[PDB]
Symmetry: none
Subunit: 262 residues, 4 copies
């Protein structure tokens, strides 16, 4: 009757251990569409110079995103796309910059809620996927004395669970730049719950595939059931890294998110 098409500024947020680099295919696809894209490295991830043992909470880990949202021009708003654990980064950011966030898009991601603790969906993912195969674990003591568990994701788990259907060049790239990470799960468990005013009010779009071999269909569906997203988009096929295995599709869904919310 009247059709709308919008260009948007997407801020792409990687999961722990990874960096801005998993978005190297989705970032140009979105830009071919005319969108402005920002792909940030979070603390101690990608080529960020900090090491994980200096980070003391998932909030400290999210600093590159909050500084960037802090820096945004007045009246400029963004769509934050977060993969896997970055749903926690979108929740931490929306309770500070609700003002600047047009929509949060969860891409095979943790979908936090306001009702339960911040660690809640982490707990449920681990119930659902408890064996991380050849992942190695380590600990350090943080600034207030918490023991923080870090991990180096195993290469079979990378191969088979996260990068199941990705190109050899993509899987090899992952092995070349992957770093330690931390869920900071015990510190998230002591954290205040996300607020309804910030996080609770953000538009929320859930993209997922039932072919994901680490965020399994029964965890994903549980998340949608536990905290109804404003929109759900299921991508047929692909694997956990839909921004590599379904780059154009994810880009088209993101155009639709722009049209609706941006």
């Amino acid at each position: 009757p009247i059709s709308k098409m919008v260009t948007a500024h997407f801020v792409l947020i990687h999961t722990i251990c990874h960096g801005a680099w998993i978005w190297h295919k989705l970032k140009p696809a979105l830009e071919r569409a005319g969108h402005k894209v920002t792909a940030l490295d979070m603390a101690a991830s990608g080529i960020d110079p900090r090491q994980i043992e200096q980070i003391n909470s998932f909030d400290e880990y999210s600093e590159p995103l909050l500084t960037f949202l802090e820096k945004l021009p007045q009246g400029e708003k963004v769509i934050i796309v977060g993969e896997s654990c970055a749903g926690l980064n979108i929740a931490i950011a929306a309770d500070r910059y609700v003002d600047k966030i047009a929509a949060g898009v969860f891409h095979n991601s943790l979908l936090p809620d306001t009702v339960h603790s911040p660690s809640y969906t982490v707990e449920k993912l681990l119930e659902s996927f408890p064996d991380w195969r050849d992942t190695e674990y380590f600990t350090f003591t943080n600034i207030t004395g918490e023991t923080i568990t870090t991990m180096k994701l195993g290469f079979v788990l990378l191969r088979e669970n996260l990068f199941t259907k990705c190109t050899d060049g993509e899987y090899e790239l992952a092995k070349m730049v992957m770093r330690k990470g931390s869920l900071f799960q015990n510190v998230l468990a002591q954290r205040p719950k996300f607020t309804e005013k910030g996080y609770g009010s953000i538009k929320k779009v859930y993209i997922w595939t039932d072919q994901d071999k680490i965020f399994l269909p029964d965890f994903q569906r549980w998340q949608i059931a536990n905290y109804k997203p404003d929109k759900v988009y299921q991508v047929q096929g692909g694997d956990h890294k839909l921004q590599l295995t379904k780059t154009e599709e994810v880009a088209h869904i993101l155009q639709e998110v722009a049209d609706a919310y941006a």
Copy 2:
């Protein structure tokens, strides 16, 4: 009397070496002594430009404490700026710490910023004479200021009453350091459950020529410790000019906090 395990922590620019007289003294009373070099200090191989905060500078201490066998507890003795290393360490490992001892040291608190006593000492002692300053940008973009302590400042202010062989030792191994003051100003305050919990003993001499009597008395009035031992005479480096006196006070702290 009670033997204890002491972890001695030098101040910025210095190294485990300022404890070369006090470590044998304590060991002659049966104590176990660990004297660590903090990052970029003593013979630690790192340079100050790769250290980005005072919590990173504390790493040798936090790794040691991370590895103390379960159920062992130590008495951390810190000189001058090392009261900040006690506070950083006590927040992370409060249950491994039998007591913190401040030897002519900054005594941080829980109500003001981590940099609060750095701010107050520089107000008491704003002219560090021939000290030279430098800056680098740390990995998150802050400009850290480093210093190279001046030898007149070393001779007259810190090592005032020290032997010529001690003063000469100091000039031969002193390295650059930093207060990371602006990063401390941004740092979360020290917690009550960690640093606030620790038993605290403050040792000083009114003959210190850089942590001057009224600043030290201010600190004591700002955050009353459990015990204050005042040594007569000496200079800022009581572990060199009053070694046995400190060894004796440290015995009273082992006795009292096991």
Copy 3:
């Protein structure tokens, strides 16, 4: 045909990651591939300001070679500036090296200074466009210049014919680097018994937009390698634009030097 173990060495500012297409290609032919990050490159945790020479920058390669089991030999493939890493490594471990392969790379020699080809390339290509430069003083007092490669230089000169996802990858993980040119100018020349001994294969394309045809031809004429393979088309990053072509040439080198 003959399988081999290749050690792939990235150029300054880059990381093991530029070999993400060539490492699987080679492995599909049964080769063993090691792709290392040099100091302060890729995800190596060091920063460029703690590296004080190109020999220190080579450390990841020299430690690997130090640890190769006795009697194993590798083919080192180095791109662009990494011909200096081959030469440094070949002088120390000549007997562990079956052949050095120079992929649009500096081909150092034994009669002129280590910096000689850095000098000649900068004469051929003096304007690095939007590259930014910085300096630090190294531990012995030299001023090292570091650079941050410019993205137009990346798009047009190095990654000319590269995919958009490859170019974008590059901007996402590129880090600072240094030629340590002045330190190389002071460095002892590469030895005949080490670097001079090694078998040498030179791979290039005349469509390189930064190691330009006449500089590459100059290098070949300055120090004739054993074999020169010229790939048609591509750009400076043949391991991304002509991956299979390089994988094939590398097979000929395994065949020939085991």
Copy 4:
């Protein structure tokens, strides 16, 4: 008839693993006498920022001394006092700056000659003292492919052989600042012999004690017999570190060296 007293500029050179710090007592003693003293850290020793794995020869190790001799004012000459392995540093320096060296003083030190290889007295010391007790050894490959052996001196060997009679505060200090070192013996063995024109012409004063428990009396005497020093001073008592156990005595002998050669 006419008596002479001279003030001199002494450059004090530590042995491998150690630094300028073992001279912290002799340097002020010499200065009480009015002498100018310079105590240098050699590469990767004391607080020199270099690590031993970047040093490729004993010549590279001696760089702080050669740069300092390079920097000396015209017509200024120095007396170089070298303890233990620093006799090799005096030999390397005299073949470059014979011009600037009034005398070389060997202080419980290796006394190189011109007749044999540079490694010769190292070989003979190891024949004489072959077991370094709790010393740990390591290797790295140098710039031209040589494997270099490094060591961390054991604390019993420190206690009993090197610091036998030193103060507890001195022995503890040693443990607090001691670093790895290398004899670079295989690279000294391929090195050109020291020249007669440089090293061979320097005045040479040998200070030693027969109480030394690592450079033993029969090695010391052999050295004196193998290459006659211009003067020999035996200090009764003390231990290997005579600059700590006989500081004033060593200082008086050095005053006599100044009077004779400086």
